[PDB]
Amino acid sequence: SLVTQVILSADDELRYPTAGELETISSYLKTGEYRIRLISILQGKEQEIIRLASKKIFQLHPEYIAPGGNASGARQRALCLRDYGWYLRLITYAILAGDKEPLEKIGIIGVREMYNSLGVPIIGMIDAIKCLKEATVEVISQEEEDFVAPYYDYIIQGMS
Amino acid sequence: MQDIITSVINQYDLSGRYLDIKGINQINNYFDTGLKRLMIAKLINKEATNLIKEASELLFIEQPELLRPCGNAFIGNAYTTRRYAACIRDIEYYLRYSAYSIIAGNNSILDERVLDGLKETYNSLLVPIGPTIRVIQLLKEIIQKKFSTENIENAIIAEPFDYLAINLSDKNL
Amino acid sequence: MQDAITSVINAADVQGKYLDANSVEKLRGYFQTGELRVRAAATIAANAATIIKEAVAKSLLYSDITRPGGNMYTTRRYAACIRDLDYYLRYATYGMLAGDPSILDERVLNGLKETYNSLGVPIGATIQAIQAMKEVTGSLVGSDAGKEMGLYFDYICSGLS
Amino acid sequence: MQDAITSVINAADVQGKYLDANSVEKLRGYFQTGELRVRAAATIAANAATIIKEAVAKSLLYSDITRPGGNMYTTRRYAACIRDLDYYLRYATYGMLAGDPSILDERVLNGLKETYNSLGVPIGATIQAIQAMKEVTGSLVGSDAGKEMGLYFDYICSGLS
Amino acid sequence: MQDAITSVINAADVQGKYLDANSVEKLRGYFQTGELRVRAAATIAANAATIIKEAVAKSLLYSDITRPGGNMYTTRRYAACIRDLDYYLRYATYGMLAGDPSILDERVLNGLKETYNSLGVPIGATIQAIQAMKEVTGSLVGSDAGKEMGLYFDYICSGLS
Amino acid sequence: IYQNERIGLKGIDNKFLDNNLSVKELIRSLAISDTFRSLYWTPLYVCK
Amino acid sequence: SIVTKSIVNADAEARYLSPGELDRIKSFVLSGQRRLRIAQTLTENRERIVKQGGQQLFQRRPDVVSPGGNAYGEEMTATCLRDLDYYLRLVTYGIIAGDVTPIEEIGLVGVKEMYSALGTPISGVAEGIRCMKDVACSLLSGEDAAEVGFYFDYTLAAMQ
Amino acid sequence: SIVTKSIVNADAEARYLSPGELDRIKSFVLSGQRRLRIAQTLTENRERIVKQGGQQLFQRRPDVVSPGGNAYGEEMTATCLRDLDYYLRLVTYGIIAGDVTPIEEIGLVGVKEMYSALGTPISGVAEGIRCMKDVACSLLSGEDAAEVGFYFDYTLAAMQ
Amino acid sequence: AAVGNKSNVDAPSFKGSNMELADSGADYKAFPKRRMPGANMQGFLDMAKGMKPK
Amino acid sequence: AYDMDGTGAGSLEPRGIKSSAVEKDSRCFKVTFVLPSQSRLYTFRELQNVYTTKMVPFSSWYAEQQRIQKMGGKILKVELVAGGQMRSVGNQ
Amino acid sequence: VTKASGGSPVVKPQLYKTASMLTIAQAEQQDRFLELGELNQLVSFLNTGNIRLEIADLLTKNANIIVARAADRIFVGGSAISYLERPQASIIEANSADIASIRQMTSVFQGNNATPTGFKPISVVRYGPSRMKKSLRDLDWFLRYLTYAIVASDPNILFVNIRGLREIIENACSSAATIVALKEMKKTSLSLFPENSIQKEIIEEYFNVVVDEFINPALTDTIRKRTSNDLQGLRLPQIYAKAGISRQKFVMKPGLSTDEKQSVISACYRQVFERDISKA
Numbered sequence A: 001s002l003v004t005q006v007i008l009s010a011d012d013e014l015r016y017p018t019a020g021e022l023e024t025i026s027s028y029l030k031t032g033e034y035r036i037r038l039i040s041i042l043q044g045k046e047q048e049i050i051r052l053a054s055k056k057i058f059q060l061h062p063e064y065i066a067p068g069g070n071a072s073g074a075r076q077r078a079l080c081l082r083d084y085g086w087y088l089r090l091i092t093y094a095i096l097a098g099d100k101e102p103l104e105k106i107g108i109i110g111v112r113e114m115y116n117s118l119g120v121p122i123i124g125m126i127d128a129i130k131c132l133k134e135a136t137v138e139v140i141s142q143e144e145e146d147f148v149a150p151y152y153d154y155i156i157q158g159m160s
Numbered sequence B: 001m002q003d004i005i006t007s008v009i010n011q012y013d014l015s016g017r018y019l020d021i022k023g024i025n026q027i028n029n030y031f032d033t034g035l036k037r038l039m040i041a042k043l044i045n046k047e048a049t050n051l052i053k054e055a056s057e058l059l060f061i062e063q064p065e066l067l068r069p070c071g072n073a074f075i076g077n078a079y080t081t082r083r084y085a086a087c088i089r090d091i092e093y094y095l096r097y098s099a100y101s102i103i104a105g106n107n108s109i110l111d112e113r114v115l116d117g118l119k120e121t122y123n124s125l126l127v128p129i130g131p132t133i134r135v136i137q138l139l140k141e142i143i144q145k146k147f148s149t150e151n152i153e154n155a156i157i158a159e160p161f162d163y164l165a166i167n168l169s170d171k172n173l
Numbered sequence C, D, E: 001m002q003d004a005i006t007s008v009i010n011a012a013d014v015q016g017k018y019l020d021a022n023s024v025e026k027l028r029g030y031f032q033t034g035e036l037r038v039r040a041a042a043t044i045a046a047n048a049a050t051i052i053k054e055a056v057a058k059s060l061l062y063s064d065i066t067r068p069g070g071n072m073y074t075t076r077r078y079a080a081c082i083r084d085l086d087y088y089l090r091y092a093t094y095g096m097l098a099g100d101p102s103i104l105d106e107r108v109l110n111g112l113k114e115t116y117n118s119l120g121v122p123i124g125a126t127i128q129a130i131q132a133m134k135e136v137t138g139s140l141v142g143s144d145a146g147k148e149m150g151l152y153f154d155y156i157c158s159g160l161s
Numbered sequence F: 001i002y003q004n005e006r007i008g009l010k011g012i013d014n015k016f017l018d019n020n021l022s023v024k025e026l027i028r029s030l031a032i033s034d035t036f037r038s039l040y041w042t043p044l045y046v047c048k
Numbered sequence G, H: 001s002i003v004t005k006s007i008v009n010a011d012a013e014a015r016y017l018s019p020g021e022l023d024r025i026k027s028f029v030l031s032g033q034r035r036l037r038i039a040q041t042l043t044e045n046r047e048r049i050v051k052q053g054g055q056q057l058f059q060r061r062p063d064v065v066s067p068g069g070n071a072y073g074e075e076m077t078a079t080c081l082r083d084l085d086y087y088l089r090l091v092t093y094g095i096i097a098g099d100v101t102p103i104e105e106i107g108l109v110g111v112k113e114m115y116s117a118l119g120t121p122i123s124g125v126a127e128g129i130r131c132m133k134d135v136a137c138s139l140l141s142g143e144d145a146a147e148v149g150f151y152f153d154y155t156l157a158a159m160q
Numbered sequence I: 001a002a003v004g005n006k007s008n009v010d011a012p013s014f015k016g017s018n019m020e021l022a023d024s025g026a027d028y029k030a031f032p033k034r035r036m037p038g039a040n041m042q043g044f045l046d047m048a049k050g051m052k053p054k
Numbered sequence J: 001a002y003d004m005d006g007t008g009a010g011s012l013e014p015r016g017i018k019s020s021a022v023e024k025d026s027r028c029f030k031v032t033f034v035l036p037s038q039s040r041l042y043t044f045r046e047l048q049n050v051y052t053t054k055m056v057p058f059s060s061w062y063a064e065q066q067r068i069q070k071m072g073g074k075i076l077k078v079e080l081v082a083g084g085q086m087r088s089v090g091n092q
Numbered sequence K: 001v002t003k004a005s006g007g008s009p010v011v012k013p014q015l016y017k018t019a020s021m022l023t024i025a026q027a028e029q030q031d032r033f034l035e036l037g038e039l040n041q042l043v044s045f046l047n048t049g050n051i052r053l054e055i056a057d058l059l060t061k062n063a064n065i066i067v068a069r070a071a072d073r074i075f076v077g078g079s080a081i082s083y084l085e086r087p088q089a090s091i092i093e094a095n096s097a098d099i100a101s102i103r104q105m106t107s108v109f110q111g112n113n114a115t116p117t118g119f120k121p122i123s124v125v126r127y128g129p130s131r132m133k134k135s136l137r138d139l140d141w142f143l144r145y146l147t148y149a150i151v152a153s154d155p156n157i158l159f160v161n162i163r164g165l166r167e168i169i170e171n172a173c174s175s176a177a178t179i180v181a182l183k184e185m186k187k188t189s190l191s192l193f194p195e196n197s198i199q200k201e202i203i204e205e206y207f208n209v210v211v212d213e214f215i216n217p218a219l220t221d222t223i224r225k226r227t228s229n230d231l232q233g234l235r236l237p238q239i240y241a242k243a244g245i246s247r248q249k250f251v252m253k254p255g256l257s258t259d260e261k262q263s264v265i266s267a268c269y270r271q272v273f274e275r276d277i278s279k280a
């Protein structure tokens, strides 16, 4: 989370948190429930969104769905929606703890070697998350989707 | 480094005086465009991996020599994919430190972390300085394609990329 | 860190005697299999990533260590596995060439089971990954070469147990 | 600024002894090549402009130091090159006659690499120009004379590096 | 750090062309002398201490650099010499195998004459030690092999001058 | 300069001492000597 | 430009700028609108100004392109026109700078050393710029042709 | 051996063995038939190689056996030949291992500390090994004498 | 064969051509003899064909 | 000299590890710990064993023990093998 | 503008290894003459020698035949081999190898199976010239570093320049239209030698190093995160560090042989003191 980054970043200098950092905790905690209210909106639309993600990741990339591709077959596609479910679940964690570590300690750190040992094309997974961010805009209004927009494209930046 | 603010405060500390209103007017000009400086930065994070890709093809479409053998001058252009891999990596940096420096509203982060020894490093590896600067402003035109209907975002985007251009030049005039 | 020739020279030297007929008898036995081990180590170097991809998909790919809560959930933790399985397939290749498993316990086995208990890495799933990795290695190098490369896999599995 | 005879006399004088058999032995070796060096310095004087025109066209003529932004773009900067390459081909001719590279570091090498770093002149392209200039110089003066003239070119390239 | 094959590949690659008949013509010339260089590097490895002991006793053993005030007086300073002469006989062995003196100026020559001037090490006595060391090296490896190993000694002596 | 090498310049001094030469031509007559060229031009870097 | 050397003139003299210097910086910047129009004409006429420039150059100097000439063959003739594209570019700089200071330190200082060292007849390249001048002044009115031609003939003067 | 240090070389470098390393393990094991023949010659010639080895050693160094020498009397002279039997044994190990790695960590590492601490002239024992070398190379052909002598002179080098 | 026969006059060397075989072209310089054009310059070569024939 | 000259907050050398070790201290611990790197997956360096047991001095145990937890290490056991306890003079 | 300068020394970055090369460097880094094992290392690759060299010329001579026979397979639209452009640097020359392609103005089939299933071959001019100006250029280059890997010691120069290559060109190229073209060169290059002779196994093993590793995921970028503020984070392609001699490390696992424990300790002397003073 954000307080953890301040306690850590202040701990390697052997000092208490300064004036600016205590702002960064205080301002983060005052915007508390709005992340809490937002994640309940997204949890009610996880079956909403991943159905829309499978819309365009496969019409864009029929290579993976076709016989021979990695996602060919039922059970391969079955977990395919599961990876969207874990990613969307991770983003609800990142939207709450207002930073990137739950998207980075999980999911991002070492993701390429995971997929490369699986056969999933790592470029395709970048479009999958980009597809997932494209899908979240429809079930979300303009007020709060740019609140969740910077959490998505960090994942794309992490995967390249 | 130093943002526009800390650079302003050091301006008044050297003279040892409090912040007058001419000093505060400089700070207010940052606070007005500060909200506009972010979606410029937020657009770059969303357009980062793309904006390097359009810059490379727009570069090599005019400099096909950079994708060719060097000549006997052992010069580092994008000849091999090992050369091409690292050479795209430099475009990462020019977009990155020119992205922070858009938010700081001041080129202090640019010269001390990019410019200092840049001609040093490229003269060692014999790297192109000419094409290296041209790709920096191919990014500038590419980024300004998005914010184009008005023209006060344009001066903001131009300031980091224009600073690297004037400073990486061997001065002809 | 001794090969078959180093171990033969050590035992013949540790008694202060020359290399008699029995010491050279084993050395001739090692030189006969010298042609087999290089070709075994040849193909294993080529299909290193393919062998590890086959073992994990055949042993522990879909088990619930792979799912959340399991010992292999996060991408850092998954990436540590194929990094970790690479050493077992690599050091076993060294034992197959040297003809002596001294390098394994010297550089792999010591402090290994004591380390996995610290991290909480499941030794049970680890050995079955190496067993499955041993099964695919017998596919590539053949039967007898698989018998040689397989002879050092279970040496790792035995000591790691 | 010492030639082969000056260096031989200095070392024989610095110990306060006469010119023994070893000191004259090298001096006789220098007088044997005295005929070769003059003819080598003869043709180099004739084809001075032709050699420099061949080196720049063969090494750095069309590279992007020649284009805008490169280190050699403007006509003042291009004209400084052939002026600059003339000294390397000229002072190397002096070392070839004197048989001792003392004149190079005395009058060329000292403060040279420290000067190019000030101007920002690429030392990498400079040495390859001298290497290409060394290659054409072996064309004119022959093999062994090129070996002599070439022996001072890389001395410049070594110290300038 | 390029050998004869690396230098041939670089020049053939730097023009973007394949290895034509002229590039392979020199490569065949290097492979012909491949048998000579290893045996030359073989005996030099064996008689490394003997060669350096012969050179210093033949060139600068009893001169007044060896006596008090000379540049080699104290035991630390004397011990630095045979340590220092070991590199010249060692790196020259590398140039003899690689067939290209690029390793010398890369790892020996650069900052060398600028370092001896700092310490005040006499460059004159240094070259004569290497010349005497070159003379004994022609004793061991033979005539043509001595011509090869000797071709890199004077390269050190030239640049170190 | 020492008396050995000043013998080569004695034609320049007494030409000046008899009021037959200026100061600037005395200065140029000294600097264009080989006694000067052998001291500050020859044993030095070309730009120093 | 006129701004930079009117400064460095008054800089050396330990003084500020006179009315004679400041009524011309003033007079030059009001001239700046008309200068960009003139340079804008030569900017996207380089296809005709260069190609017709080398038109009359070869008709007047067939030696340089004939076998034995410096610009002989498909190769050198391309570079034969490349230099004219250079000098046509510098004239666009001089028109906007209001002076041959850009043309001075680019393409003029030490130009005889380059072309003598390249084997190129320096008189031949002077003939090339004169042929470009008639094409350039034919593209503009009389008030402009007294300027655009005015910078070419300075380049003609320094190039011999 | 060549097998164990070609491994530990590539072991430290985090890589496998190159063709340069694997075409020599290959080249060494085909050489293994010829190595055992060479070591088999020195194995049951230790009676002559040692006894004639100490032959020339005393004729060249009578001080070490004279009264006051380290190997004086019936006792020390027996141990005087015992060490030569040691070093002759290690050369048989180096020939079969294809390297002085057996000779390195046995009889060479810290050898000057032992013989200096025993009062033995280390130069004298070096003379003994050289006398054994002429006897050993006299027992083999020219192709073999370039090997069996080759390991002795390494022991000569490290023993001074 | 030299064919030095007689009347080796000096003036009036004429014209024509022959282009005799090289040699020694069996040596080994590592660099070519250079040439501009390529990349950055296909525009003007194609375009100096225009005036080539004039 | 020793690490307690008067340095604390607001002092010229940066605020850092301050050990209570005397002049040339001769006390040393015997520690045991695992310390996973947590940085190999974006650096891709070679791997080294993380379970170590070694003798650290008293002069720098606190810095090491303060750092072993910095990178998520766990200390399994430490002892004071060499040195006395409650010893006024003699730790030197 | 930068108001200071550290200087730019001439640095030659690593490009590849060769068998004649790294073993000269390994004992170099340990501060020793190479030993008889490594002297036996440098010799019999030189003893490979002309066998490696003749593989180049026989491969180099019919380079067009190697490239053209791939062109018949995966390029519709007549010949479509005009866009070859062998001299790729724009030089007049110094000397040229001989290739000498089509003379008079796909001939016999009898075994020719390229596309494993319904793979779409790139047509032609639909594809366009500028993109076509590379495909023959890269079918060129695969013939090249192979004929630099034969002439060198190892296949390492191929591995550095083919690892992430398929990803970079993956958008302007159907990747399977490369694997067909790369497996046509081995099928063509195996026409030259009597098989089950020594040369047949040499060059075959170098073709499958480049084509099978071509279909292989690219290495991940290495990151250099800094510890404190004033530093700056970097990032390097993992391709970049695996080219060249690749300097070694030393570890002190207690239980090594006391030489390799001695070579590591003396390796520690050279690091901290810059010269092994125990040797000196």
Ligand SMILES: CCC1=C(C)/C(=C/C2=NC(=C\c3[nH]c(/C=C4\NC(=O)[C@H](C)[C@H]4CC)c(C)c3CCC(=O)O)/C(CCC(=O)O)=C2C)NC1=O
Residues within 6 Å of the ligand: A057, A064, A065, A070, A071, A072, A076, A077, A079, A080, A081, A083, A084, A086, A087, A106, A107, A118, A119, A120, A124, A125, A128, C057, C061, C062, C066, C067, C073, C074, C075
């Ligand atoms: C919390 C972070 C996290 C992720 C993401 C994760 C992924 C993951 N994906 C897997 C497989 C897979 N994943 C895919 C994926 C896809 N095919 C497509 O076309 C798509 C673009 C993509 C899905 C959106 C396929 C086809 C397989 C099966 C490959 C095989 O085994 O043959 C596997 C092997 C076992 C399994 O399916 O559970 C893991 C562990 N583990 C994690 O801990």
Ligand SMILES: CCC1=C(C)/C(=C/C2=NC(=C\c3[nH]c(/C=C4\NC(=O)[C@H](C)[C@H]4CC)c(C)c3CCC(=O)O)/C(CCC(=O)O)=C2C)NC1=O
Residues within 6 Å of the ligand: B066, B075, B076, B077, B078, B079, B082, B083, B084, B086, B087, B088, B090, B091, B093, B094, B097, B113, B114, B121, B125, B127, B128, B129, B131, B132, B135, K013, K014, K236
């Ligand atoms: C933060 C600011 C910053 C920059 C910019 C930077 C650049 C940088 N560029 C490098 C190399 C390189 N850079 C290139 C780049 C190019 N080649 C071309 O032909 C083109 C002109 C250009 C691409 C635009 C190439 C080919 C190399 C490798 C040279 C070689 O090994 O041959 C290297 C050496 C490898 C390494 O990274 O360790 C550094 C340090 N470092 C920095 O800290």
Ligand SMILES: CCC1=C(C)/C(=C/C2=NC(=C\c3[nH]c(/C=C4\NC(=O)[C@H](C)[C@H]4CC)c(C)c3CCC(=O)O)/C(CCC(=O)O)=C2C)NC1=O
Residues within 6 Å of the ligand: C065, C071, C072, C076, C077, C078, C080, C081, C082, C084, C085, C087, C107, C108, C109, C112, C115, C119, C121, C122, C123, C125, C126, C129, J036, J037, J038, J040, J047, J048, J049, J050
């Ligand atoms: C060369 C001899 C040698 C070995 C074998 C070795 C292992 C080793 N495995 C580790 C971790 C690990 N190892 C695994 C492995 C697994 N998870 C599973 O479910 C499977 C059963 C298993 C794969 C087969 C995981 C997930 C971690 C990360 C643990 C963590 O982050 O807490 C770590 C911690 C540090 C790191 O990976 O950077 C070490 C040191 N070190 C050595 O020097």
Ligand SMILES: CCC1=C(C)/C(=C/C2=NC(=C\c3[nH]c(/C=C4\NC(=O)[C@H](C)[C@H]4CC)c(C)c3CCC(=O)O)/C(CCC(=O)O)=C2C)NC1=O
Residues within 6 Å of the ligand: E065, E071, E072, E076, E077, E078, E080, E081, E082, E084, E085, E087, E107, E108, E109, E112, E115, E119, E121, E122, E123, E125, E126, E129, K275
């Ligand atoms: C691998 C390339 C390379 C070389 C050659 C090298 C030389 C080098 N020689 C040194 C000293 C020295 N070198 C000598 C050498 C000599 N005295 C004489 O009279 C002779 C002429 C000469 C022996 C031939 C002496 C006496 C010192 C010690 C100087 C001192 O203590 O002041 C030192 C100072 C540090 C030290 O020795 O630990 C270096 C770094 N370093 C390198 O990296």
Ligand SMILES: CCC1=C(C)/C(=C/C2=NC(=C\c3[nH]c(/C=C4\NC(=O)[C@H](C)[C@H]4CC)c(C)c3CCC(=O)O)/C(CCC(=O)O)=C2C)NC1=O
Residues within 6 Å of the ligand: D057, D061, D062, D066, D067, D073, D074, D075, D078, G064, G065, G069, G070, G071, G072, G076, G077, G079, G080, G081, G083, G084, G086, G087, G106, G107, G108, G118, G120, G121, G124, G125, G128, I036
């Ligand atoms: C901006 C100022 C400026 C100029 C003018 C300039 C000229 C210049 N002209 C060149 C060549 C050349 N220039 C010519 C020119 C000519 N042949 C003729 O017959 C005509 C008389 C004449 C042109 C009208 C030729 C033939 C070459 C190639 C010479 C060779 O290949 O040896 C080259 C070397 C190749 C290159 O890098 O382009 C330079 C640098 N550089 C500059 O920075």
Ligand SMILES: CCC1=C(C)/C(=C/C2=NC(=C\c3[nH]c(/C=C4\NC(=O)[C@H](C)[C@H]4CC)c(C)c3CCC(=O)O)/C(CCC(=O)O)=C2C)NC1=O
Residues within 6 Å of the ligand: H064, H065, H069, H070, H071, H072, H076, H077, H079, H080, H081, H083, H084, H086, H087, H106, H107, H108, H118, H120, H121, H124, H125, H128
């Ligand atoms: C395998 C490597 C190896 C060696 C070489 C070795 C040497 C060794 N030499 C010894 C004694 C000795 N060695 C000598 C040797 C000599 N006297 C001379 O004059 C000659 C110069 C020289 C022999 C050629 C003598 C006289 C003693 C007995 C010294 C005493 O009794 O004080 C001893 C003590 C008695 C014993 O245990 O044998 C050892 C251990 N041990 C080893 O493990």
Ligand SMILES: CCC1=C(C)/C(=C/C2=NC(=C\c3[nH]c(/C=C4\NC(=O)[C@H](C)[C@H]4CC)c(C)c3CCC(=O)O)/C(CCC(=O)O)=C2C)NC1=O
Residues within 6 Å of the ligand: J018, J019, J020, J021, J058, J061, J062, J065, J066, J085, J086
């Ligand atoms: C951040 C978590 C953490 C803690 C708590 C910690 C404690 C710690 N306390 C120490 C000593 C000490 N601690 C004390 C403390 C006390 N004496 C008393 O009478 C009181 C009961 C008590 C004060 C409340 C004393 C006197 C020493 C010095 C002991 C000696 O010199 O022998 C030392 C030895 C080294 C040093 O101080 O430089 C450590 C490492 N280290 C850590 O990393």
Ligand SMILES: CCC1=C(C)/C(=C/C2=NC(=C\c3[nH]c(/C=C4\NC(=O)[C@H](C)[C@H]4CC)c(C)c3CCC(=O)O)/C(CCC(=O)O)=C2C)NC1=O
Residues within 6 Å of the ligand: B067, B079, B080, B081, B082, B084, K131, K132, K134, K135, K136, K138, K139, K141, K142, K144, K145, K161, K162, K165, K168, K169, K172, K173, K174, K177, K178, K181
């Ligand atoms: C010597 C080993 C080696 C190779 C091969 C190599 C290739 C390489 N191919 C490239 C592009 C390309 N390569 C190709 C085509 C193809 N490539 C193929 O291997 C197929 C035969 C064909 C498709 C069927 C195309 C169309 C491009 C342009 C892609 C783009 O526009 O980005 C590029 C980017 C620069 C360029 O535009 O050329 C490199 C660096 N580099 C190397 O170091």
